[PDB]
DNA sequence: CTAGTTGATCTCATATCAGGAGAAGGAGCAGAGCG
């Protein structure tokens, strides 16, 4: 058996469905977005969207509709999963806590049935008397709702029309009436049935069948004043109410088919319609007294290619795209002088269909960096993805041995931090940093003979300084020191803390509380505590008055984070931490919900607790180990919120997203100290002090994965990296219509240089395929080599062949003519990139599409339609066949390791081929004889072959252990839920063996790695217990979710660890964790799960 | 195909699209593969073939010579040309070999370890594949034309057996009860087929020109009697309500079990609504059968459009189930074709015939 | 109210009155009703089998399961000596059943054919004697009876008697027998009873005899060859498991 | 009109050599066409 660990590096980003309604509360307007397995609940504010919850379904969300049963206060959510788990979910918020309770659940799969072509349709009666599901041909599954089920017992009604295109429930009908477009051999017709829940059968509909357009594909039920339906077809929009039959054939909608629609109003006087090109139309119903007088369609503008779109309010439309970035657009009443009313407000990153990718160690670091062909037709792009915050440094000053950083506004009028005070060993150094100029000057009011433990700007246009002996309150406006407080015993200050109003200093084992007032430093609260002081923070949070009411301390020999009551310095709460290393940093900070207290040790351990403004009680202890060196915490307010920064040998920016704390890495060497800085020239900038210098950089976003976007405006298909040439070869495809004309300026049409394929070998809308050479620094299209008319560039490999030293871009193509089903012609072109031009070094006309190429020990291994052949690169610079293998249906995927070739077939699924070099021919080592339709293949080890099935499954074949030795054994099975397009070795970061990344159609980037048997057994047992503890949203079983699933097979997973489920082990409270770890201690498993999370 | 690959790769089309479309294309391109052979072991005509439902690797074959052959359909050799070798065989020297023609053979659904076979020697034998020995024998008072185990019933393991008697025998392989009889037919039952959808729905076709759907739980006779006309010629049911104008010698539920295909010696194939037995009026043209015994024909599975492969004399006629359009005639046999069986994993067909051959039809390219 | 798997709401204020075996018997009867098959309540005397029948039919009427909105017309064929008892039992358990006796004593005081027509027209509960089934065997079997309960169904023990033929001339799937002993002398009686409740389950009586009765009795003698006794044991096991889901018999 | 009693009437159990003469079927077979 094989042991594999799958984890999600990037959650899916493609939006397959969105609905709006009052889900989170009766007064709120929610936007619920289904990304493949993630459900995102947003609240539609007057500006943007404020996320409230993001839950992960154990299922691909196929249907998602909000409905309000009689008596319900707020909307319930119906979700159907691709595996046919139906659930009705309610949002129950109990104060701070947010829950998604499963009001009902079930599994609605018929044991047999032809899953319908058009796909799962799920509709709800507008009076919530039933949910209709069209899952299979010839059946219409009904889940009644007036009968309060908890199991959603569903019954089939035999639907005599076997090919139903779309169906909706009509409005204003005494009984639940479905209206559906169906296809029979005589054409497409719209028919209506009334569903009788008591007779559990259909009845004659209100209005007879009507013969409609040949491609009538969408039905829109129109609300109560009008009723009836609007059938959208390819060329016409028709309206039916039983006697009224309006029809328009707007020429403007003929260019592309309308694929999503949405009702802007409640009475349906206006509909948004999105087509496959990204146009957005408004369909208007003009009423007459009420009946409907006439229909109008007008083109609002352009958006991302919408899968779904939702009208929120005030003209704001959420454009849900599977192929591009989703957009949040606005509808203005008037045009923008270019004919468009659509104005994009926001763009949500979507690594669209990741069709190919490479991990390049670009920037010559030790870190991989994915470069993905993301997106599609108009939305095509290259996305560059790395696990780093991105220092983005602008200046530096070489100042050795820094021990302090604080921003200062030396100029009184300016509110900007245009000065920095620094402490090194025993003195104070001021820096002016005026604009971009940086210099070392002395500021009035600061002692240069004593160290600065702390200093900062305070209220009353005042500064304050805490040195090792005294505290000096600098009156910036009038003159030098006027208020100074000195410890009565002339004891040195061991720790300091201060905010905009007050002060707390530690002298030995005693604490002093000082409050800053104009020309006054008044001591109020004082005590001499049990042990020495270690670290402090009194930063007010949610201040609202001018003073913080609480205090946080760290003590010696009783290693613990204590809390104190500020006016009296009594002991509020104690959490014991332990260890032989004293606390170093203590900070309290708001993270998106409430107050958290962050305390760190000298070994990189760091503890975050949930703190309250009344009691000051630390709850939900969770511990996280970052770094191997002491840490300090500094707070900086970015655009969105406060993002605390952790300074250590492993600098790490801490903030919280979606009401959970996460640790984003910063990828420089080391950071002793940091402080925020917003100078006239440096906005929201940082100042990272290390042992040597002070780097002054900003950080772009802190999302763990930084995603650059290189818009191509054309569908990219393949990508390979040529290091010697410092470029990416990207096969792209753009759609031109007519001789031919580009519909838009794509990256291929806007290259520096260009060229066209002039080949002597072979003698509506069409796809033009190009080879783009893209600079790997600036990502500009250095060159665009257009391929022949009707030539599809499929594969692209970069390699050096034979013995010549040149590195070649080798493209495999096929000739596509509409008269044929399989290319009979194709060619392999060898290009060399030099002098900014792309010369054609060689060609080889082959007799099929070259679906895949891999360079194979200096030889070229191509897979023409069903044959896999090996080419040799002769000294003459031409490709010469060496050996063939013909035993394939269609060799689509090829991988290589040494002498072994893994051939993924279209439907025979893997064949381990070996090139036996002494003879010069291939030999079938083994084959997996199951009929798995491949989407990709990979080689993990000398004897493990990963494959991705087209039904969203991963399987691992293994060379077994006579003729039964020719049977590869599927030792691993796992339902991923994503359609994997690419595997590739590499990892995005600097216990587990190997690392294979993969990209999916939905934008998931996942990572497969091998575990050992010991680790695998341990984690499988934990996996079972987390299933016993974690409660899934639809009460779906994890085992069922990860069960290998195909229409003719279903097995429980095996040999695979869902790393996602394991890594959820950190997101649970201590009692539940203790329940998980019944039969070694929990902190040990934290060691394991942390070490596991580091691999991605 | 490249458009299909790109649409699958970019998510425009569900992968179900590529599976069903390409499977349909392969079925339309189904052609006699001389690049594959089945080892000739039957001295007489092959009456029946049955590929196992799970893993589709092994096939059974019963001949008129009374022998059973168990073939391997996987290319275990590294060449592109191979012969489907005969793994096992109940030959003339096996002590339990059938004395007369093996008319039907069926793998036990849910597992490959057991299979049952019926003969004109008035026996339904249950064989343990591993030991290749009979585990049970059901003797009947009259020769068996067809037997069938429900492909779907996880609960009951009844074998519906149609013999020359007017009654349909139900034999429980779970502890042995071959007493239950479904009465209501008037002549030999030439075909029996359990619904793939409902555990307890059994369709039985007889030489009295009637097809009846039974609910074997029910104690009150047939659910429905198939009627050619649906009521245009209506009579008090004593002789009317015939499914065909001759003997009905073949039954086959469509893949989803929502329709039933019956072929009769009136040279017609009809498609019926399996819930209310209503003729769908699909034409199918003329389907030549003059078989005096059960005619085993199959349907396709997992394609965009369903197909039916019916023995048409010496050929296999391929039709679209829901439109009647004859796709094609596969012509490679020398005598009448008795049975065809569909390998749904690769859209392959195997057809046996009275010429003592089993021909594999593989998709071309 | 107690609820079964598909939904059969036997009322709580009746279901609570039954004993555990009685509730098991009601469950078994309703499983038969779902399978649309008949059975034999072969529980010996004194356990109470009428209580089970009225409880099950009352639940089937209140539950409104459906053909017929709830329970349709049912005929109970019992010996004369218990007919009045039956009506009283109904009237004390489930009053709203319009129960009526077909007898010379009776209460109709008009033509008996009119009584059959009127009772069937109201989906009533009609009680007869076996003799009336035999005599009016053509008349009484025209009104689409939904249930047939042969109380003391061992009157059907002879597959030749005219009462057996008249009782097997009913058409409903629902045939229940309340007999303290399904068989009394030999297996002829078991075959006759099973031919009543389920026409097809056991084979034609020749087949049944030649397979079961002769081997069992031949293995019931102590001078039988070992093969004979082993075959008798096997055939008895086959008959037992064949009749297992349709004969509910409980001892003391 | 109403029971109650009393015969008839019917159903269901439990036993194990000194004929002859003609007509119709059938079988062996010779021979003639004839594909």
PDB file of N, CA and C in Angstrom, chain A residues 736-742 764 766 789:
ATOM      1  N   UNK A 736     -10.662  34.296 -33.492  1.00  0.00           N
ATOM      2  CA  UNK A 736     -10.896  35.288 -34.521  1.00  0.00           C
ATOM      3  C   UNK A 736     -12.072  34.810 -35.349  1.00  0.00           C
ATOM      4  N   UNK A 737     -12.821  35.760 -35.907  1.00  0.00           N
ATOM      5  CA  UNK A 737     -14.150  35.423 -36.400  1.00  0.00           C
ATOM      6  C   UNK A 737     -14.224  35.153 -37.902  1.00  0.00           C
ATOM      7  N   UNK A 738     -13.905  36.126 -38.742  1.00  0.00           N
ATOM      8  CA  UNK A 738     -14.198  35.968 -40.174  1.00  0.00           C
ATOM      9  C   UNK A 738     -13.348  34.846 -40.794  1.00  0.00           C
ATOM     10  N   UNK A 739      -9.237  38.219 -44.417  1.00  0.00           N
ATOM     11  CA  UNK A 739      -9.909  36.955 -44.184  1.00  0.00           C
ATOM     12  C   UNK A 739     -10.442  36.781 -42.774  1.00  0.00           C
ATOM     13  N   UNK A 740      -9.573  36.921 -41.778  1.00  0.00           N
ATOM     14  CA  UNK A 740      -9.956  36.783 -40.383  1.00  0.00           C
ATOM     15  C   UNK A 740      -9.628  38.072 -39.644  1.00  0.00           C
ATOM     16  N   UNK A 741     -10.301  38.269 -38.514  1.00  0.00           N
ATOM     17  CA  UNK A 741     -10.162  39.489 -37.741  1.00  0.00           C
ATOM     18  C   UNK A 741     -10.144  39.150 -36.266  1.00  0.00           C
ATOM     19  N   UNK A 742      -9.206  39.743 -35.545  1.00  0.00           N
ATOM     20  CA  UNK A 742      -9.135  39.559 -34.105  1.00  0.00           C
ATOM     21  C   UNK A 742     -10.260  40.323 -33.429  1.00  0.00           C
ATOM     22  N   UNK A 764     -18.228  32.303 -39.168  1.00  0.00           N
ATOM     23  CA  UNK A 764     -17.931  31.365 -38.093  1.00  0.00           C
ATOM     24  C   UNK A 764     -16.856  31.961 -37.192  1.00  0.00           C
ATOM     25  N   UNK A 766     -12.638  30.894 -35.806  1.00  0.00           N
ATOM     26  CA  UNK A 766     -11.531  29.961 -35.844  1.00  0.00           C
ATOM     27  C   UNK A 766     -10.537  30.334 -34.760  1.00  0.00           C
ATOM     28  N   UNK A 789      -2.663  28.199 -40.373  1.00  0.00           N
ATOM     29  CA  UNK A 789      -4.104  28.211 -40.400  1.00  0.00           C
ATOM     30  C   UNK A 789      -4.608  26.836 -39.981  1.00  0.00           C
TER      31      UNK A 789
END
